[PDB]
Amino acid sequence: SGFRKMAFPSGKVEGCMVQVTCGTTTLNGLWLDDVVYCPRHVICTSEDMLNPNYEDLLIRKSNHNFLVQAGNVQLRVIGHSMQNCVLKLKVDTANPKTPKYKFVRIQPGQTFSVLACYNGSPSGVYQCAMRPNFTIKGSFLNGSCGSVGFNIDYDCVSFCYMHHMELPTGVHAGTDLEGNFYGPFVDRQTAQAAGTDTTITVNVLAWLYAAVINGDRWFLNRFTTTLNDFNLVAMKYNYEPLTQDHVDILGPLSAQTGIAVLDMCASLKELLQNGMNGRTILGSALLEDEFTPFDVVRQCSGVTFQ
Amino acid sequence: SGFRKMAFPSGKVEGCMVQVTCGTTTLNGLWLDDVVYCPRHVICTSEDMLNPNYEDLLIRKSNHNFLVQAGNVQLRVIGHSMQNCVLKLKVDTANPKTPKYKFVRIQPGQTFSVLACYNGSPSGVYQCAMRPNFTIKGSFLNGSCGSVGFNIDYDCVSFCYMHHMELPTGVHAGTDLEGNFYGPFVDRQTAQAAGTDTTITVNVLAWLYAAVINGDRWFLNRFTTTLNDFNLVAMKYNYEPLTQDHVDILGPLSAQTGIAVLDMCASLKELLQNGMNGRTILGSALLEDEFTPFDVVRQCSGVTFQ
Ligand SMILES: [Zn+2]
Ligand SMILES: [Zn+2]
């Protein structure tokens, strides 16, 4: 029936994208009701150096210095303010395409969709995960700052990510919509060293359950294991240790499939110690960890109206 | 900077999705101006057998038997007709969200975005390719028929695919928006055998150029080859033979990168004969063939308004 890396429908977010220009600098903003949210470094001058005190850079920036447009049409800025690492530009008009929304701060290992945008206009949409070291591995060119990541629960955009910078490795760092960076990262072009790339165990298992639900059966074996035994293997291959909380989340998929969570762990243990035999799983030649148990259930599925 | 499997913004297509019900059966339709397009087998009874003559099944179906809704609101059907394997339902109201659009018939090896839909409402969006054997490897559950695939040139949805059936392998077959199936497939639940899964050579090369543009350099070697020599290797590993036409398309990427097309072919030759050394490329542990040269250029990129 088919399991694909699946993004959320993005039309609701397309309707909120604007471009924001300050001085010379140009990035994207998110227009929700009468507020536009964007990265505060729209105010700088784009280098290493020269003044970093966003506070004092900001003392020099009046409402009329923030130029906010998308589609053709100008928005009038009546107030501004800095909230951690984001700016909130109050505009005189409420976005008529404002969707029901929430801001949340996502947890590591959660997935979300990113609408990549270049100075105000949609480019594309893709799915990714918040990595255990709080980077994300995205697709962001010079211009994409202020692009956002989000989920939709069946009736709602929850916004979870705003893009702010690329690191050395070429991985990506950003904030929630309250302006707080994920991880230790800061909006300043200094070294940071990313952090241990580590694999999201509960997501790999969920994806293995997806493979079975589609007939890519071969990695079923006749073994079982225990949480403590599996976690030894996990802390050799730099996987998240598995807990009973992970086991509980996977409960519906084990019962959806009749395959006990610890039996699936033994399949995974075997795949880790022995690799994939030149074989593949759901057209993947390595283990996949950016589908949550939530993402898998949703994709052999339920919702409807007929 | 980052290269991801990237779908098109889908809000323009979200605005055209409706559900269509006939009898008992329920699938999706595409509402553009005053026409709704949907698979003709919305009229059957959903099995192997019983009457297949879509013509005569259709003689029994009046305008008022076609129930067309999305969001809450009913559309009035004033005419219907069969165009190859699609139905065209004329409705009394033009879709006010009609985007500038075209229908085209895509070529094998071209990619497009699919908006997976379940009886009228958006579920998710993903990117895929039309395979050389004219299947696509998608994610389509019971209900997804009438979901569409499309591209956007910078100002336009060109619709290229409508989903109609799953085959034995669990791969997918469908039509263009004129109702003609891609490949030899027919809207009847009989065996068909898919056809040789064969790899889209020019797309793999384009993706290798993407890897270089991002620093996943290791598969550069000090070899070259010729088209005829490379194509021998291609017809051992079931790759499309490479032609000068493919070489010409890749021209901009070779000059974007300074790496001659035939030198990149020699890198690919080496990867085919020797595998990937347990190494990966753009976080892929196998060669990737559903990015076109068009898709790669667009993703270290150009477009703008600042
Ligand atoms: Zn930014
Ligand atoms: Zn159908």
Helix (H), strand (E), coil (C) string for A2-49: CCCCCECCCHHHHCCEEEEEECCEEEEEEEECCEEEEEHHHHCCCCCC
Asked if A139 and B19 come within 8 Å (Cβ–Cβ), the reply is: no
Tell me if residue B145 is catalytic: yes
What is the pairing mode between strands A17-22 and B111-118? unpaired
- Is-contact A185 A172, C-beta < 8 A? no
Q: Kindly provide the b/e burial profile for residues B8-28, where b requires at least 16 CB atoms within 10 angstroms of the residue's own CB.
A: bbbbbbbbbbbbbbbbebbbb
Half-sphere exposure of B203 (CA within 13 A, CB side): 22
Ligand nearest to C-alpha A20: 1
E strand or H helix at B264:
helix B261-274
**Max CA separation in chain A (angstroms):** 68
CB-closest option in B14, B126, B285 to A286: B285
3-state helix, strand, coil in chain A (%, to 5): 25, 30, 45
CB-closest option in B5, B11, B278 to A14: B11
Q: How far apart (Å, rounded) are the C-alpha atoms in residues A21 and A247? A: 48
Q: Which bin fits B125, alpha (ψ -120 to 50), beta or left (φ > 0)?
A: beta
- Quote the ligand 2 centre to A134 CA distance (angstroms): 42
- Which residues are B19's β-sheet partners? B28, B69
Q: Which bin fits A8, alpha (ψ -120 to 50), beta or left (φ > 0)?
A: beta
Q: How many CB atoms lie within 10 A of CB A262?
A: 18
Token couple for A135: 């980077």
Of B81, B75, B61, B83, the C-alpha closest to B31 is B75
One of A41, A163, A172, A246 is an active-site residue; which one? Answer: A41
Asked if A9 and B122 come within 8 Å (Cβ–Cβ), the reply is: yes
Q: How far apart (Å, rounded) are the C-alpha atoms in residues A18 and A147? A: 10
- Is-contact B156 B100, C-beta < 8 A? yes
CB-closest option in B12, B283, B284 to A137: B283
The technique is X-ray
In the three-class reduction of DSSP (H, G, I as helix; E, B as strand; rest coil), residue A297 is classed as helix
Token couple for B100: 């500038």
The beta-strand segments (E) located in A138-260 are 148-153, 156-166, 172-175
What is the pairing mode between strands B156-166 and B121-129? unpaired
**CA of A260 vs chain B CAs: smallest distance (Å):** 25
Chain centroid to Cα B154, Å, comes to 18
Asked if B1 and A280 come within 8 Å (Cβ–Cβ), the reply is: no
Q: How far apart (Å, rounded) are the C-alpha atoms in residues A260 and A150? A: 32
Contact list, A123 vs chain B (CB under 8 Å): 6, 9, 301, 303
Which amino acid belongs to residue A61?
Answer: K
In the three-class reduction of DSSP (H, G, I as helix; E, B as strand; rest coil), residue B14 is classed as helix
Q: How far apart (Å, rounded) are the C-alpha atoms in residues B272 and A205? A: 30
Q: How far apart (Å, rounded) are the C-alpha atoms in residues A190 and A48? A: 7
Q: What are phi and psi of B180, to 5 degrees?
A: -90, 125
CA distances from B127 to A12, A125, A181, B13, B137 (A): 19, 10, 30, 14, 10
Size of interface A-B (CB pairs under 8 A): 156
Q: How far apart (Å, rounded) are the C-alpha atoms in residues A166 and A198? A: 19
- Is-contact B46 B25, C-beta < 8 A? yes
Contact list, A215 vs chain B (CB under 8 Å): 170
Q: Dihedral (C-alpha) B234, B239, B245, B249: value to the nearest 10 degrees?
A: -110
Which amino acid belongs to residue B229?
Answer: D
Asked if A305 and B120 come within 8 Å (Cβ–Cβ), the reply is: yes
One of B16, B38, B41, B172 is an active-site residue; which one? Answer: B41
- Which residues are B90's β-sheet partners? B35, B79
Token couple for A266: 């033994």
Asked if A120 and B305 come within 8 Å (Cβ–Cβ), the reply is: yes
Of B231, B229, B211, B224, the C-alpha closest to B276 is B211
Q: How far apart (Å, rounded) are the C-alpha atoms in residues B30 and B67? A: 13
E strand or H helix at A111:
strand A111-118
Q: Kindly provide the b/e burial profile for residues B181-192, where b requires at least 16 CB atoms within 10 angstroms of the residue's own CB.
A: bbbebebebeeb
Asked if A284 and B285 come within 8 Å (Cβ–Cβ), the reply is: yes
Q: Which long-range contacts (CB under 8 A, 24 or more apart) does A12-16 make?
A: A12/A97, A12/A99, A12/A152, A12/A157, A12/B11, A13/A99, A13/A115, A13/A148, A13/A150, A13/A157, A14/A115, A14/A122, A14/B9, A14/B11, A15/A95, A15/A97, A15/A98, A15/A99, A15/B11, A16/A95, A16/A97, A16/A98, A16/A99
